[PDB]
């Protein structure tokens, strides 16, 4: 999927951090958020997040739109494992169903509805 976070961090390091943070914060989930390749939108100022497990995917989506300063008129989509996630899922549910072997959840965003 090409996340710069993976390019910058050896797997063993990611897995150790993800396991530790999930044990430490049972009510939060570790999430990497990055702009998809080719997307015509801003990069986020931060890519590594600790997100409340009860926040919904839809709420997190609107928060990300604000953090990249997107006008409400503009398009944006999330991709998790190359799939647009259900907006009513909580971030904890999305994490449980989609975290990688390093215990991080990865979310890409794009102005195009295809990753």
């Amino acid at each position: 999927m090409k996340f710069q976070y993976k390019e910058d961090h050896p797997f063993e390091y990611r897995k150790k951090e993800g396991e530790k943070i999930r044990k430490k914060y049972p009510d939060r989930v570790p999430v990497i958020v990055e702009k998809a390749p080719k997307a015509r939108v801003p990069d986020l100022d931060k890519r590594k997040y600790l997100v409340p497990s009860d926040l919904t995917v839809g709420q997190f989506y609107f928060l990300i739109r604000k953090r990249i300063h997107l006008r409400p008129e503009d398009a944006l989509f999330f991709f998790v494992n190359n799939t647009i996630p259900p907006t009513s899922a909580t971030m904890g549910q999305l994490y449980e169903d989609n975290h990688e072997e390093d215990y991080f959840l990865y979310v890409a965003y794009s102005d195009e509805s295809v990753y």
Binding site: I21, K48, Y49, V51, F60
Partner: peptide, 8 residues
């Protein structure tokens, strides 16, 4: 490497 915390 710090995490950015999202508040509820």
């Amino acid at each position: 490497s710090t995490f950015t915390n999202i508040s509820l």
